[PDB]
Amino acid sequence: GCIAKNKECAWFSGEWCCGALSCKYSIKRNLKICV
């Protein structure tokens, strides 16, 4: 159970992204997802 580099990610979602990526803003996705 982890957030991939494409799925939304809240700064307080409580979960973490896969591998070792963080939650950044994606202009192209006009939202906030991991990378």
UniProtKB/Swiss-Prot annotation:
Principal location: secreted
GO molecular function annotations of the record: sodium channel regulator activity; toxin activity
On tissue specificity, the annotation reads: Expressed by the venom gland.
Reading the lineage from the top rank, the first entry is Eukaryota
The alphabetized UniProt keywords are: Disulfide bond, Ion channel impairing toxin, Knottin, Neurotoxin, Secreted, Toxin, Voltage-gated sodium channel impairing toxin
GO CC list: extracellular region
The listed locations are: Secreted
| Further comment | May be interesting for the development of therapies to treat the periodic paralysis hypokalemic 2 (HOKPP2), since it inhibits I(GP) leak currents of HOKPP2 p.R222G/W channels.
Family, as annotated: Belongs to the neurotoxin 07 (Beta/delta-agtx) family.
Sum up the protein's function in the record's words. Gating-modifier toxin that inhibits mammalian and insect voltage-gated sodium channels. It shifts the voltage dependence of channel activation to more positive voltages. It shows potent activity on Nav1.4/SCN4A (IC(50)=103 nM), Nav1.5/SCN5A (IC(50)=268 nM) and Para/DmNav1 (IC(50)=555 nM) and lower activities on Nav1.2/SCN2A (IC(50)=1447 nM) and Nav1.6/SCN8A (IC(50)=3504 nM).
The protein in question is named Mu-thomitoxin-Hme1c
Organism, as annotated: Heriaeus mellotteei (Crab spider)
